[PDB]
Design a binder for this molecule. Sequence first.
Ligand SMILES: Cc1nnc2n1-c1ccc(Cl)cc1C(c1ccccc1)=NN2C
Length: 127
Amino acid sequence: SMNPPPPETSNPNKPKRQTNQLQYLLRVVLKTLWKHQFAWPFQQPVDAVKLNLPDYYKIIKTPMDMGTIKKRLENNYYWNAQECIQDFNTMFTNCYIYNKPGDDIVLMAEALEKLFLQKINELPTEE
Ligand SMILES: Cc1nnc2n1-c1ccc(Cl)cc1C(c1ccccc1)=NN2C
C-alpha cells in the first residue's frame, strides 16, 4: 500500500546522447501527449496512497509515467530512442494490466497511445 521510490531520472555514470530521434521524442512525441486533455493521470508517478490503490505496486513492478519520461528527456538520460519508446510502451501496458477494458483511465491511455503511434510512425531516420 506504500509508494515505492520513483523511477530513476539521473545516473551520472550512464552514458548519454542527444540524437535527432531523441530530440523528436521530446519536441514532438512528449509535447503532443503532455498537452492532451487526457494527459493529467500520466504526468507523474501513480500515488497509490492518495488514490487508494494499495495493490497497484503489488501488480505493477515496472512503473512508468510521462513525468519521469519528461525528466529523462530534458536531462538527457537516454542513449537511444528505443529506450524512450520502451518507457512510453511500459506506461501504457501498465495501465492496461492494472485496469479493465472500457474503464475511463483505459480510454484515456488508448487515446494517448493512438497519438503516440501516429507520431512514432514518422520517427526520423537517425542522422
Ligand atoms: C495512470 C493510472 N493508471 N491507473 C490509474 N491511473 C491513474 C493515475 C493518476 C490519477 Cl490522478 C488517476 C488515475 C486513474 C484515473 C481513473 C479515472 C479517471 C482518470 C484517472 N486510475 N488509476 C487506477
